[PDB]
């Protein structure tokens, strides 16, 4: 068909690289590829220039030089795809040119040390951790600078504070019950700030007198002038402020440290809070943070501005510099690069600790290179990091958007100093500054709400870890294509008109305009304007944008949509919406789902397994096509060629459609005939009915890939093995698993079959004497070997598809200790649609398949065409999620109009326009009718009569005509496939793009009866092929109690759970078809008693006669 785009906002510039964040943050943190170790250390190399120069020089031993020179790395031991296979971690060792000298000018330079290797970032932006696709979430924090927070407790004034960001850096705060106390709080210990004022080299005079001027209230300062006359005195004294007790020898112990050492600096050389402080405190500072060199003493252009500012603040109107924390202009975002580097430092610093412990017993010169070395500490750090990092989580590649959007998220969780689970209500809040930076709407539904968010599509973060948003410069009515990314603060400085502002060429088209001044909803004649929003899109997260008519549904339900799209699964019969916002196309590119042409040429070869092409110049590049492959979440991930031989094609041209890409457009589902209306309560509550037809069309049919594993352990009781030869009884149970241990690929397996055959030795390989006899009676070969083969877990299986075997694989296998070899089998299954699956439209409208109807009874139109799905209308009012409605309305036209549409967000379609298209369509739908010698269905009349009584149609009009009128209201006439009789009332029908949602194995259909039992608690435990029990809790106890079902609750917790002997006796009883024994004491309790006793506490069960009672019936009574 033909695509018809809408709205007319001139997006001056297309969207930015997406994963871009992850990619560059990292790119700008390594300096590998093109970086010649020339002019920069910004990240890791800075991580270097700090862990260096590490010295241990006593001018006596003289020179003990050990500095950095050049960092290096570059041989990924193995290839990505290969790393995944053997549960490896794609990365590359890291060498380093260093230098150790000697007082004797002994400059021996062992320019090598590759002990540690570090992970690498995929072409898409993710990581491979132990074969697992892992992802790193960029989290936010309170940018390092100076702030003045209104003192909470006392509603009289407020507290100021400072924040450099090292793992062991300063954290200043000020306050005062001033009479004298210049309350200067440090770690947990405060005192008068004055004392410090002189250590600076300034007394009450140079300070309090010249400054305490406008700050006439500087009495909260000047109290000890004598302490303020010879820097040196106050100087020493202050140490007091520290424990335990040391002599005034270290004239500058903790000083030089809080001067030009990593501590004081927020960022390197000011960048962090300099702009902050400085721009909010007059001018620049002393070098980078607080430093003073070639003078000895220490000059502080720090507290200098600070204090006086708290004054300029604890004053009248000298700047009124309050501090809205949530203000984005005051919150930084740590990104992978940065985020990782710090972790790089810890284990790094953890190595220097190591290296310094070496100068001790280090020979004269039997120490030079790496005899002073050890990666493990640092190795662990980072390793430990990724692998076990809170922000390190399995790549969510449910589909692409899923995987992509996942990258775009922002955490507020993590650093035990930068993150806290103390629900910060107002922090979870959507602060004004979020506009065009954070998806106001996109956020995980659940207690993690407002803590995890997505990035506003257009929003971008600069190396300073700050976001910025697109804005075009305005000139008294004239609109410039000159864009301007900008931050939160800078933003408040201006007046921003909404993008959608009427225009002409560039001249604005309005006497009054819609804008916001630093979040100020205002109207203004043009001249007054300064900047305009580039495009609505810039506000919301990406997937959020994928929603059509967003401007029509309530944000809340909207939230649902976004989330859901991420949970959308790749159908075989992929389909992009009959209507799109506009991103779909751009997405696939960035997601890296499909393949495009990096130049023009002819289609060389294109077999299903691969494609090759010749370039203009004449280059033959065969493109290995990743075939059917598992998703982290097991979904299928495959690309499909759409181009053919001899076919010429230019750059940017697609070649193979990713998993969920159609024509190169996102196809998170399928478009279909939905008819909104109640159907015998089968769509009762969110419940959704389905035209059996769809299945026949294998529409909603997916392919899940499931992987299983097994281990060869060299047991102490003797190693176990993978053999087709097992103590098993039958043979028909070996039909397929005949391949000398393994099951032959491509086999229809069902819960209970043997993917793999394994055997070991039980009961410490001691055959029961009981069993003994039995066994002998039929050939007593007590094979000490127990069959412990791998079976298909219950529920369901599918058919084999692939098998991988690792035998301490000399090629690179690193089998876990105790493991001889391992095995992996992958089973696929075309999970098709069935009663239960859940579906959702981009409009938060979600629900489950309640019933599948026979196309017959299925509601159809006069032209005997049945819709495919029936949607109850109730789920809308209480949802105010109209959007979908329109989507269907238009979904209906293009249906006949054999086309698709692109309606922009807060733009695109408009009732008229739609109301229009229908009319056209009405021709197709209706028009033909007569050209077939066909008039109006008698029943059609029936309805219409009724139709106008509802003021739907304008009375007296031609029956035929009336229809149109109706049609335009998106409603049509429907016949009941069952009764045939029409439906008393028009029915709005039409197309809707729907998605099938992912099925969590946790959401699987469980059902236990009896099985494993926690070795301790002695309570139902679930195995691999055995289910677990339901967590029966107090809430349920309470409920039960309320009713009064004594027994149940008892047996419930006893027999059914903790009472040992019971259950068995129970089982048996049932078996023999007998009644049930009574409940004894639950281990839980017995156990309890013991615990008590163990705590030296007699617990005594007694009767009426107050006579003790043994709950252990014997095994407690001794002697």
């Amino acid at each position: 068909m033909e695509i018809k785009r809408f709205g007319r906002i001139r997006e001056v510039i297309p969207l930015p690289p997406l994963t871009e964040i992850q990619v560059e943050s990292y790119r700008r943190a390594l300096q590998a590829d093109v970086p010649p170790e020339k002019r920069e250390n910004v990240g890791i190399q800075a991580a270097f220039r700090e862990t260096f120069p590490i010295e241990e020089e006593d001018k006596g031993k003289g020179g003990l030089v050990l500095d950095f020179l050049e960092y290096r790395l570059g041989e990924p031991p193995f290839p990505q795809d290969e790393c995944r296979e053997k549960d490896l971690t794609y990365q590359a060792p890291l060498y380093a040119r260093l230098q150790l000298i000697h007082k004797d000018t002994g400059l021996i330079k062992e320019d090598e040390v590759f002990l540690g290797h570090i992970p690498l970032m995929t072409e898409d932006g993710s990581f491979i951790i132990n074969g697992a696709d892992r992802v790193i979430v960029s989290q936010i924090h309170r940018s390092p600078g100076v702030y003045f927070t209104p003192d909470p407790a006392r509603p009289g004034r407020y507290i100021a504070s400072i924040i450099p960001l090292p793992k062991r850096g300063p954290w200043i705060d000020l306050e005062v019950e001033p009479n004298g106390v210049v309350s200067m709080k440090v770690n947990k210990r405060k005192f008068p700030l004055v004392l410090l004022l002189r250590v600076l080299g300034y007394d009450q005079e140079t300070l309090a007198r010249e400054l305490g001027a406008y700050g006439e209230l500087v009495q909260g300062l000047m109290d000890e002038s004598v302490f303020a006359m010879r820097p040196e005195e106050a100087l020493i004294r202050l140490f007091t402020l520290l424990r335990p007790g040391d002599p005034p020898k270290r004239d500058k112990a903790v000083a030089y440290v809080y001067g030009l050492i990593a501590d004081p600096r927020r960022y390197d050389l000011g960048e962090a809070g300099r702009y902050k402080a400085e721009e909010k405190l007059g001018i620049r500072l002393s070098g980078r943070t607080l430093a003073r060199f070639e003078d000895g003493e220490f000059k502080d252009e720090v507290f200098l501005p600070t204090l006086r500012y708290l004054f300029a603040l604890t004053a009248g109107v000298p700047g009124h510099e309050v501090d809205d924390i949530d203000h984005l202009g005051n919150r930084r975002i740590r990104t992978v690069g940065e985020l990782m580097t710090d972790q790089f430092r810890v284990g790094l610093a953890r190595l220097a600790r190591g290296v310094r412990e070496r100068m001790l017993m280090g020979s004269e010169d039997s120490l030079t290179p790496a005899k002073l070395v050890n990666s493990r500490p640092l190795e662990a750090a980072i390793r430990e990091f990724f692998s076990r990092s809170q922000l390190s989580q399995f790549k969510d590649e449910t589909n692409p958007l899923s995987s992509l959007r996942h990258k775009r998220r922002i955490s507020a969780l993590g650093p035990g100093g930068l993150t806290r689970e103390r629900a910060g209500f107002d922090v979870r809040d959507v602060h004004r500054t979020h506009y065009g930076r954070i998806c106001p709407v996109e956020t995980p539904e659940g207690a993690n709400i407002g803590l995890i968010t997505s990035l506003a599509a257009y929003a971008r973060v600069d190396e300073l870890g700050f976001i910025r948003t697109p804005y075009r410069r305005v000139v008294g009515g004239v609109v410039t294509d000159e864009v301007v990314y900008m931050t939160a603060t800078e933003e408040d400085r201006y007046t921003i008109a909404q993008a959608n502002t009427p225009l002409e060429g560039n001249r604005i088209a309005a006497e009054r305009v819609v804008a916001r001044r630093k979040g100020e909803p205002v109207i203004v004649s043009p001249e007054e304007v300064e900047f305009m929003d580039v495009s609505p899109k810039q506000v919301f997260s990406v997937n959020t944008n994928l929603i059509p008519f967003l401007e029509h549904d309530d944000a809340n339900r909207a939230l649902m949509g976004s989330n859901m799209q991420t949970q959308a699964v790749p159908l075989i019969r992929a389909q992009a919406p009959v209507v799109m916002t506009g991103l779909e196309e751009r997405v696939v590119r960035d997601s890296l789902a499909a393949l495009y042409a990096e130049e023009d040429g002819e289609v060389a070869k294109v077999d299903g397994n691969r494609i090759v092409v010749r370039y203009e110049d004449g280059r033959l590049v065969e493109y290995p096509l990743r075939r059917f492959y598992r998703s982290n979440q097991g979904t299928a991930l495959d690309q499909r060629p759409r181009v053919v031989v001899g076919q010429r094609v230019r750059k940017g041209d697609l070649l193979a459609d990713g998993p969920a890409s159609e024509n190169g457009f996102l196809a998170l589902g399928q478009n279909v005939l939905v008819a909104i209306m109640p159907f015998d309560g089968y769509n009762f509550e969110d419940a959704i009915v389905i035209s059996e037809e769809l299945l026949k069309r294998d529409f909603y049919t997916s392919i899940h890939i499931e992987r299983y594993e097994i281990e060869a352990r060299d047991t102490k009781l003797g190693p176990e093995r993978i053999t087709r030869d097992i103590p098993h009884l039958s043979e028909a149970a070996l039909r397929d698993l005949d391949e000398e241990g393994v099951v032959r690929i491509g086999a229809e397996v069902k819960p209970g079959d043997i993917l793999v055959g394994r055997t070991s030795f039980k009961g410490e390989s001691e055959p029961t004497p009981e069993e003994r006899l039995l066994r002998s009676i039929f050939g007593e070969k007590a094979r000490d070997v127990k069959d412990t083969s791998l079976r298909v877990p219950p529920g369901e299986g599918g058919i084999v598809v692939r098998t991988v075997r690792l035998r301490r694989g000399d090629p690179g296998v690193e089998l876990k200790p105790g493991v001889r070899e391992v095995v992996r089998v992958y089973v696929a299954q075309k999970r098709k649609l069935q009663v239960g699956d859940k579906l959702a439209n981009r409009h938060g409208n979600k629900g489950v398949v309640a019933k599948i109807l026979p196309v017959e009874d299925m509601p159809h139109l006069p032209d005997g065409t049945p819709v495919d799905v029936i949607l109850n209308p109730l789920g809308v009012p209480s949802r105010m999620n109209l959007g979908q409605i329109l989507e269907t309305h238009l979904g209906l036209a293009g249906y006949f109009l054999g086309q698709r549409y692109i309606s922009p967000i807060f733009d695109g379609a408009k009732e008229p326009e739609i109301k229009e298209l229908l009319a056209q369509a009405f021709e197709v739908y209706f028009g033909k009718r007569k050209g077939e010698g066909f008039g109006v269905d008698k029943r059609e009349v029936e309805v219409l009569r009724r139709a106008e009584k509802l003021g739907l149609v304008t009375p007296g009009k031609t029956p035929e005509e009336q229809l149109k009128e109706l049609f335009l209201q998106g409603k049509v006439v429907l016949y009941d496939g069952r009764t045939g009789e029409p439906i008393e009332g028009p029915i709005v029908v039409g197309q809707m793009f729907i998605m099938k949602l992912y099925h969590m194995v946790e959401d699987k259909m469980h059902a236990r009866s009896t099985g494993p039992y926690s070795l301790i608690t002695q309570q139902p435990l679930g195995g691999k092929a055995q289910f677990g029990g339901q967590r029966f809790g107090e809430m349920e106890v309470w409920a039960l109690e309320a009713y009064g079902a004594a027994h149940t609750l008892q047996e419930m917790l006893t027999l059914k759970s903790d009472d040992i002997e019971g259950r068995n006796a129970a089982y048996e009883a049932i078996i023999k078809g007998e009644d049930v024994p009574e409940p004894s004491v639950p281990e839980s309790f017995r156990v309890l008693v013991k615990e008590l006793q163990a705590l030296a506490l007699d617990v005594q069960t007694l009767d009426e006669k107050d006579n003790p009672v043994d709950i252990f019936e014997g095994l407690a009574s001794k002697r």
């Binding site: 352990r713 102490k716 876990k816 200790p817 301790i1016 013991k1090 030296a1096």
Partner: protein, 57 residues
Amino acid sequence: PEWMILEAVPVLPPDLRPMVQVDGGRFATSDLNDLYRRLINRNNRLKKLLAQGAPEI
């Protein structure tokens, strides 16, 4: 009252603070044993010392 003091320290049944083998040559337990251990250690050491008419210090 005397009861509140101790000289007879109880001990949980084994299977309630078990010791089990787990992975390729390793096992697991409850801290108790440990706690328990150290304790015993101390007491028995003590015995000797007294048995050693040692400096009451």
